[PDB]
Design a protein around this nucleic acid. Structure first.
Lengths: 153, 156, 314, 275, 373
DNA sequence: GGCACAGGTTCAGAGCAGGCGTTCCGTTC
DNA sequence: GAACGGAACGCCTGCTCTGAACCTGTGCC
C-alpha cells in the first residue's frame, strides 16, 4: 500500500523536479518498475555517456531500499560486469544506510556522485579499483572507450 | 551383589529369613576373607579400594540387613548375633586401617575416612535402635576399642 | 612502552585485524584499561566497542572486570563529590547498550558476566556489585534468556543484603569490626533515580523486581525476627522500587497500576495490605493516571461482591 | 541509646540483682537472665558471661567421672539446681549459637576478599573463651533430653566453624608462611581441653539408658542416631583438614591431637529374660 | 426475564428456598433462560448444598447450551467453585467441554469464552495450581485434548508464579512420548486466533525448549515456531523468524544448528512466505565471524535454494547481494574470509547448476579458481 | 475428678548444599 | 614418559529448618 503512496510522489516528483543529469519514468516495457537515465558525470571518463538503470521497488518499500543496476555497461571500481552497485543506501542498517528520510531521487543523485567519485575501499572490481588509483589514465581511457561503445548512441 | 538383597517382613516365613541370614553371613565371611588380605598386601590402590568399599558394603548392611534383623531377632537371635560379631572382627580392622591413614598422614586414604567412621558409628547406634524395637534398649552395651595398626599392635 | 593517549583507540583498531594469543590480547586490553583513568569520558564508548570485537576472540572476563571496577570507581567519585552527572549518565547508558549488543551476539559472555557478578558467599557480592553492574543486569533483563537467572540473582542478592543488616545491629560485636558496606537496598534506588536521564531498557526489570519481591515475601505468616523482618524488608523495598518507577516514569505508570490491582482484587486468597498501601501512595501522588486506567476500575466493581470487606473498603 | 550512662547503670543494676538474689520462681529467673543477655549483647560480645554460667553448671550438676569436687555459686545467684537444668542450660547454649553464627559470617566474608590480622585475633579470643564455656558443660553430668542434645549439635557447629577457620589459614600459609602462635595454641587447646572430653561425654550419654507407637518410636530413635555420627564426621573433617594444613604449612599440628577413638558395640544376656 | 431479574426485590425471606426449587424446575424445562436464573439464584438467599446440586444440574446439560451464554455460566461455576470442589468440577469441566463441537459468531464467542477463562484462572491461583495438578494426573492417557495444550500455553502467558511448574510438567509430559505433532496440528489448525492472542507465550516457550537437551524437547521448540509461522499473520511471522535469527547470530552451536534446520524446513515448505522476511535471513551476514564452516555451508545452501525457487526470480535482490558479498570476501587478503567466500561460491554454483545460468556458474567458478590460484 | 495451659511432638512443606557424572590434569613408577 | 588417581562444574535429591495444630501430660480448684 505504502509502495503506491511513495511511488505516487516519486514518479510525479521525477517527471516535475528530477536531480541534475538525471531522469526517472515508469518504464514503457515494465509499467511497475522505474527506468532512470544518469548522464555521465562532468570531468569523469563517463562524459558523453547516457547510463540506463533499472530501479526495482521492493514490496515493503519504503521499509527496504530500491534495487538498482547499471543496464548500460560501466567500467568502474564499485560496479561489476553485471551492473551490481556497491552502495550503502542500497542496503539496510547496520551494513547499509537506507531509511525512509531518503527517496529514489536522493539515491540516483548518490549514483551520479559514485559515477564521478568511485570508492576504492568498496571494490567489486579489484582490477578497476587498482587501475582507478595506480594508473588513473588507463582507467579513464578504458571507461571513456566504455562510454563510446555502450553509453553512446 | 549384596545391595540386590531385599530385607523381608515379620509376616514372611522363617525359611526365607534364615536363607537371607545365611546369604548375609556368606557375604560377611567373603568380606572378612578380603579384609584379611590387607596386612600381607600393603599398597596405595588396595588401601583406596577397601577404605572406599568398606563403608559402601557397611551401607548395604545398614539398609537391607538391619530391617530383616528387627523382624528375625526373637526367633533367629543367635544367627544374627553371630553375623554381627563376625562383622565386628573386621569392623575393628577398618578402625585400625583408619589409624594407618591418620599416622601415615596419607591424603588419598584420609578422603573416605570421615564417612567410614560416621557410617560405622551409624551401624553401632542402628544396633541400639534394633534393641529399642525388640524392647531391650537396657541390653545395648558400648565400650572403646584398642587403637591397633592393621596387623594388630597397640600403637602408643 | 607507553601508548599515544589521543590514538590508544586507533592503535587498538590495528590489533583487531592481526591474530593474537590469550597473553597477547590480555596485555593489549590491560594497557588499554590502564589508559581509561587518564582520558576524557566520551571517547570511552567506541574504545569499549574496539576492546570487545577483540575480546570476543579471547579475553572477555578482563573487559567486563575492568569496565565495571572503573565505572564503580567513577560513580564513587560522583557520590563523594555530591557529599558532572549529565555527561557520565549518557556515556554509561551508551556503554551498557554496547555490552548488551555484544551479549546479543555471544551468550557465553552473558554467562561469564553472571558468574563474575555471583553473590556465592555473602562477602563477594559486597565488592562484585554496584549501582552500575545492577544497571547492567537490569538492562540484560531485556534479552529473554537471562531474565530468570538475573532476577533470582538480584532477588537473593537482595535478601542476603537484609540478613547482613539485621545481624550486624543485634550484636555490639560485629559493628566494631565491619565498616558498614553499601547495601543493595540503597544501590538499586539510586539506579531508579538515574533512569531519569532516561535509560528505558532498565525500567522493565525494576518494575519486574519490585513486584517479585512483593510476591515472594508477602505477609502470609500474618493472614519473631528471622522469618518476619527480612521478609517485611523485601516488599518494603518492592514498594519503594515501584513507587519511584511510577513517580519518575510517566509512560509506565499505566501498566504499573494495572498490575497492582490485577493482584489486589481477585486474589484475597493470600492477603495484600502491603499492595493496598502501595496502591494508596501511587494514586495519592497523581490520581490523574487513574482516568486512563478506569477500564480495570469498572471490572473491579464486577467482583466487588466476592472480594471481602477490607479489599473493597480501601 | 546502647552507650548512654543510664543504659550502662541499668545493665550494672540488672547484673548485680542476677549475681545476689536466688528466687525459686522459674520464668522470673529465666527472665532477669533474658534481660541481662539482651542488655549485655549491645555493650560487648557475650562469651565472658557464658563461661561463668558453664562453670556454675559444672559446680552444680557434678561431672561424668563421679569424683571431681567443684562449686562456683559466686558467679550468678539466679542459677539453682532446680533452675539451671532445663533453664539456664538452654539460655547459655542459644547465646553461643548466635556468637558462633557472628564469627562464621565474619570468616565467610574474610575468605571472600582473597583488615585481616585484628579480625582473626578477636575470632580466636571468642573461640578460646567459649571453648572454656564448651569444656565446662562437656565435663558436667547434664540431664538427657534436648538439654544435652542441643549441646552436642552446637559442638558439631563449634568444630564446623573451626574447620572453616583452618581452611582460610590454608589459603594464607601456602602463599607466605605463618599459622601465628594464637592459631597453633587454638588447635592444641581443641586437642587438650575439648576433643577427648567429647569422647568421655559421647560414651557417658550413649551407655546412659533409662506405651510407644512403633512409627513415632522409630522416628524418635532415628532422630537421636544422627548427632553423634555427625559429631564424629565434623571432628574427622577438622582433623582431616588439619592433616592438609600440617603437610602444606610444614608444621604437623597432628602432634597436639590424638589418633581417632573408635567404637565396637555389645549385646548382653538380658535378651533371653525379656523374649 | 425482567420478572426473574426483579424477583430479589419482590420476595420475602420465608419464601427464598421454595422459589429456588421451582426455578431449578424451570431450568431443566427451558434452556434459553439459563442466564437470568443463574444470576437470580446467586442474588437470592439460599443453602449452599442446594447450589452444589443445581451446579451439577448445570453441568449435565452443558452440551445443550448455545455458546453465547457459556461465559457467564462458567463464570458462575468458578465463583460457586470452592478450594475443595476444585478438581471435581475441573475434571468434569475439563471432560464435558469440547471446543471441537461449537464450529463466524461461534469463533468470536469462543475467543470471548477464553477471555473470560483467562480472567477466571488469571485471577485465582486456586484454579491454576489445581488445574495443572489435574492435567499432570492426565499423563496416563495418550488421549488428552486440544484444550489441555491451549490452556497450558494460557497459564504460562498469564500466570507467573507457576512458570517453572508449567515447564516442569510440560517437559516430564513431552519426554514421556506424550504431546506430539497430531495434537499441535489440530490445535493450531482450529484454535489459531485464540493462539494469535497469546503470541508472546508461544515463542517464549519455543525459545525455552531450544535451550534444553533431548531432541524430543528441541523438536517441539522447533515445531512450535513451525506452526506459528505456517499459520499466523505477517506480524507474528516476522516475530517468529526474529527469534530464529536471534538463535543464529547469538546462541551456542545446538541452538544455531536447530534454528538452521528450521529455516531450511520453512523455505522448502513456503518459499513465498520467507521471501517477505528474507532481508532478516541476509541480516546474519553481519556476524559471519561468530559462526562455523559447517553452519556456513548450510546457511549459503538455505539462502541459495530460497533464491533458486523459480517463481521468486523477480526478487533476484538477495541473489545479487550474495554474488556481491562473495566477490568482496574473496577479495580480502585474509585466509579466514576467502574461505567463507569459497564455501558460499561453490554451494551457490551447485544449487544454480541443479545457457545463461551455465555462463553464470562458469564465471563464478573461474573467478573463485582465479582468486584461489 | 475435671478442665485448660503448656509444651512435646508430628507432619506439611519450602529451601539449601553437597555428592554424583562426564571430563581434564597432577603425580608416581 | 605414560598410566593412574584426584580436581572441576552442571544436575538431582535428601536433609534441615520452619512453622502450624493437635494432643497428652499435668497443674489447681
Amino acid at each position: 500500500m505504502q509502495r503506491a503512496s511513495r511511488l505516487k510522489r516519486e514518479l510525479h516528483m521525477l517527471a516535475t523536479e528530477p536531480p541534475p543529469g538525471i531522469t526517472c519514468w515508469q518504464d514503457k516495457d515494465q509499467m511497475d518498475d522505474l527506468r532512470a537515465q544518469i548522464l555521465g558525470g562532468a570531468n569523469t571518463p563517463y562524459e558523453k555517456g547516457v547510463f540506463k538503470l533499472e530501479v526495482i521497488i521492493p514490496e515493503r518499500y519504503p521499509f527496504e531500499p530500491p534495487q538498482i543496476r547499471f543496464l548500460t555497461p560501466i567500467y568502474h571500481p564499485n560496479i561489476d560486469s553485471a551492473g551490481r552497485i556497491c552502495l550503502d543506501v542500497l542496503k539496510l542498517p547496520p551494513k547499509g544506510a537506507w531509511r525512509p528520510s531518503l527517496n529514489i531521487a536522493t539515491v540516483l543523485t548518490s549514483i551520479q556522485l559514485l559515477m564521478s567519485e568511485p570508492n576504492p575501499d568498496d571494490p567489486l572490481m579489484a582490477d578497476i579499483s587498482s587501475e582507478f588509483k595506480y594508473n588513473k589514465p588507463a582507467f579513464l581511457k578504458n571507461a571513456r572507450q566504455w562510454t563510446e561503445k555502450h553509453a553512446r548512441q | 551383589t549384596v545391595k540386590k538383597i531385599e530385607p523381608g517382613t515379620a509376616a514372611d516365613s522363617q525359611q526365607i529369613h534364615e536363607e537371607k541370614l545365611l546369604y548375609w553371613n556368606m557375604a560377611v565371611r567373603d568380606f572378612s576373607i578380603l579384609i584379611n588380605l590387607i596386612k600381607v598386601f600393603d599398597s596405595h590402590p588396595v588401601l583406596h579400594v577397601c577404605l572406599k568399599y568398606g563403608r559402601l558394603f557397611v551401607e548395604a548392611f545398614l539398609k537391607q540387613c538391619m530391617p530383616l534383623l528387627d523382624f528375625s531377632f526373637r526367633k533367629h537371635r543367635e544367627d544374627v548375633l553371630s553375623l554381627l560379631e563376625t562383622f565386628q572382627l573386621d569392623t575393628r580392622l577398618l578402625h585400625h586401617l583408619c589409624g594407618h591413614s591418620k599416622i601415615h598422614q596419607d591424603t588419598r586414604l584420609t578422603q573416605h575416612v570421615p564417612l567410614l567412621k560416621k557410617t560405622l558409628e551409624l551401624l553401632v547406634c542402628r544396633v541400639k535402635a534394633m534393641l529399642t524395637l525388640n524392647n531391650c534398649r537396657e541390653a545395648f552395651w558400648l565400650g572403646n576399642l584398642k587403637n591397633r595398626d592393621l596387623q594388630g599392635e597397640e600403637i602408643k | 612502552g607507553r601508548w599515544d593517549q589521543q590514538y590508544v583507540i586507533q592503535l587498538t583498531s590495528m590489533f583487531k585485524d592481526v591474530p593474537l594469543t590469550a597473553e597477547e590480547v590480555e596485555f593489549v586490553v590491560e594497557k588499554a584499561l590502564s589508559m581509561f583513568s587518564k582520558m576524557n569520558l566520551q571517547e570511552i564508548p567506541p574504545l569499549v566497542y574496539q576492546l570487545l570485537v577483540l575480546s570476543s576472540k579471547g579475553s572477555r572476563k578482563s573487559v567486563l572486570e575492568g569496565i565495571i571496577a572503573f565505572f564503580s570507581a567513577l560513580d564513587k567519585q560522583h557520590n563523594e563529590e555530591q557529599s558532572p552527572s549529565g555527561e557520565l549518565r549518557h556515556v554509561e547508558g551508551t556503554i551498557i547498550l554496547h555490552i548488551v549488543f555484544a551479549i546479543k551476539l555471544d551468550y557465553e559472555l552473558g554467562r561469564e558476566l553472571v558468574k563474575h557478578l555471583k553473590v556465592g558467599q555473602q562477602g563477594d557480592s559486597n565488592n562484585n556489585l554496584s549501582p552500575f553492574s545492577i544497571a547492567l543486569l537490569l538492562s540484560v533483563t531485556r534479552i529473554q534468556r537471562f531474565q530468570d537467572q538475573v532476577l533470582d540473582l538480584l532477588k537473593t542478592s537482595v535478601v542476603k543484603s537484609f540478613k547482613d543488616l539485621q545481624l550486624l545491629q543485634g550484636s555490639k560485636f560485629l559493628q566494631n569490626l565491619v565498616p558498614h558496606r553499601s547495601y543493595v537496598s540503597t544501590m538499586i534506588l539510586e539506579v531508579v533515580k538515574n533512569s531519569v536521564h532516561s535509560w528505558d531498557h532498565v525500567t522493565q526489570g525494576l518494575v519486574e523486581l519490585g513486584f517479585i519481591l512483593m510476591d515472594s515475601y508477602g505477609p502470609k505468616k500474618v493472614l519473631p525476627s528471622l522469618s518476619r523482618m527480612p521478609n517485611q524488608h523485601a516488599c518494603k523495598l518492592g514498594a519503594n522500587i515501584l513507587l519511584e518507577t511510577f513517580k519518575i516514569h510517566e509512560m509506565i505508570r499505566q501498566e504499573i497500576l494495572e498490575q497492582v490491582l490485577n493482584r489486589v482484587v481477585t486474589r484475597a486468597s493470600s492477603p495484600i495490605s502491603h499492595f493496598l498501601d502501595l496502591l494508596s501512595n501511587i494514586v495519592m501522588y497523581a490520581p490523574l493516571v487513574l482516568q486512563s486506567c478506569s477500564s480495570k476500575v469498572t471490572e473491579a466493581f464486577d467482583y466487588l461482591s466476592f472480594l471481602p470487606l477490607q479489599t473493597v473498603q480501601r | 541509646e546502647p552507650s548512654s550512662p543510664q543504659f550502662v547503670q541499668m545493665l550494672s543494676w540488672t547484673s548485680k540483682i542476677c549475681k545476689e538474689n536466688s528466687r525459686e520462681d522459674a520464668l522470673f529467673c529465666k527472665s532477669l537472665m533474658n534481660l541481662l543477655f539482651s542488655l549485655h549483647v549491645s555493650y560487648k560480645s557475650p562469651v565472658i558471661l557464658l563461661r561463668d554460667l558453664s562453670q556454675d553448671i559444672h559446680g552444680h550438676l557434678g561431672d561424668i567421672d563421679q569424683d571431681v569436687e567443684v562449686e562456683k555459686t559466686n558467679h550468678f545467684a539466679i542459677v539453682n539446681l532446680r533452675t539451671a537444668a532445663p533453664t539456664v542450660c538452654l539460655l547459655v547454649l542459644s547465646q553461643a549459637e548466635k556468637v558462633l553464627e557472628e564469627v562464621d559470617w565474619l570468616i565467610t566474608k574474610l575468605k571472600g576478599q582473597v583488615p585481616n590480622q585484628p579480625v582473626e585475633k578477636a575470632i580466636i579470643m571468642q573461640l578460646g573463651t567459649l571453648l572454656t564455656f564448651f569444656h565446662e558443660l562437656v565435663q558436667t553430668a547434664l540431664p538427657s533430653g534436648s538439654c544435652v542434645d542441643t549441646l552436642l549439635k552446637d559442638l558439631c557447629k563449634m568444630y564446623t566453624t573451626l574447620t572453616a577457620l583452618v581452611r582460610y589459614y590454608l589459603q594464607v600459609c601456602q602463599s607466605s608462611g605463618g599459622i601465628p602462635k594464637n592459631m597453633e595454641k587454638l588447635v592444641k587447646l581443641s586437642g587438650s581441653h575439648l576433643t577427648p572430653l567429647c569422647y568421655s561425654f559421647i560414651s557417658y550419654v550413649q551407655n546412659k539408658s533409662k506405651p510407644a507407637v512403633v512409627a513415632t518410636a522409630m522416628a524418635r530413635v532415628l532422630r537421636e542416631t544422627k548427632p553423634i555420627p555427625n559429631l564424629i564426621f565434623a571432628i574427622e573433617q577438622y582433623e582431616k583438614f588439619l592433616i592438609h594444613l600440617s603437610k602444606k604449612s610444614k608444621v604437623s599440628l597432628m602432634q597436639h591431637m590424638k589418633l581417632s577413638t573408635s567404637r565396637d558395640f555389645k549385646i548382653k544376656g538380658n535378651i533371653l529374660d525379656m523374649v | 426475564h425482567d420478572i426473574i431479574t426483579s424477583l430479589p426485590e419482590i420476595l420475602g425471606d420465608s419464601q427464598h428456598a421454595d422459589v429456588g426449587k421451582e426455578l431449578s424446575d424451570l431450568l431443566i424445562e427451558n434452556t434459553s433462560l439459563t442466564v437470568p436464573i443463574l444470576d437470580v439464584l446467586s442474588s437470592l438467599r439460599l443453602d449452599p448444598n442446594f447450589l452444589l446440586k443445581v451446579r451439577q444440574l448445570v453441568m449435565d446439560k452443558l452440551s445443550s447450551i448455545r455458546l453465547e451464554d457459556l461465559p457467564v455460566i462458567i463464570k458462575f461455576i468458578l465463583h460457586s467453585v470452592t478450594a475443595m470442589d476444585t478438581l471435581e468440577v475441573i475434571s468434569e469441566l475439563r471432560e464435558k467441554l469440547d471446543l471441537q463441537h461449537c464450529v463466524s459468531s461461534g469463533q468470536s464467542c469462543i475467543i470471548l469464552l477464553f477471555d473470560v477463562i483467562k480472567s477466571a484462572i488469571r485471577y485465582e491461583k486456586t484454579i491454576s495450581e489445581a488445574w495443572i495438578k489435574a492435567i499432570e494426573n492426565t499423563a496416563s492417557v495418550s488421549e488428552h485434548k486440544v484444550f489441555d495444550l491451549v490452556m497450558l500455553f494460557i497459564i504460562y502467558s498469564t500466570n507467573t508464579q507457576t512458570k517453572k511448574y508449567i515447564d516442569r510438567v510440560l517437559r516430564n509430559k513431552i519426554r514421556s512420548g506424550c504431546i506430539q505433532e497430531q495434537l499441535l496440528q489440530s490445535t493450531f489448525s482450529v484454535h489459531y486466533l485464540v493462539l494469535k492472542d497469546m503470541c508472546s507465550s508461544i515463542l517464549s516457550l519455543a525459545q525455552s525448549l531450544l535451550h534444553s537437551l533431548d531432541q524430543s524437547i528441541i523438536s517441539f521448540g522447533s515445531l512450535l515456531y513451525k506452526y506459528a509461522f505456517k499459520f499466523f499473520d505477517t506480524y507474528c511471522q516476522q516475530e517468529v523468524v526474529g527469534a530464529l535469527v536471534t538463535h543464529i547470530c547469538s546462541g551456542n552451536e545446538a541452538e544455531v544448528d536447530t534454528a538452521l534446520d528450521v529455516l531450511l524446513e520453512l523455505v522448502v515448505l513456503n518459499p513465498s512466505a520467507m521471501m517477505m522476511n528474507a532481508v532478516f535471513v541476509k541480516g546474519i551476514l553481519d556476524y559471519l565471524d561468530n559462526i562455523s564452516p559447517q553452519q556456513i555451508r548450510k546457511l549459503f545452501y538455505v539462502l541459495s535454494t530460497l533464491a533458486f525457487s523459480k517463481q521468486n526470480e523477480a526478487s533476484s535482490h538477495i541473489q545479487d547481494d550474495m554474488h556481491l558479498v562473495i566477490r568482496k570476501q574473496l577479495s580480502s587478503t585474509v585466509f579466514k574470509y576467502k574461505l567463507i567466500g569459497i564455501i558460499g561460491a561453490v554451494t551457490m554454483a551447485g544449487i544454480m547448476a541443479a545457457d545463461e545460468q551455465c555462463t553464470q556458474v562458469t564465471s563464478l567458478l573461474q573467478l573463485v579458481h582465479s582468486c584461489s590460484e
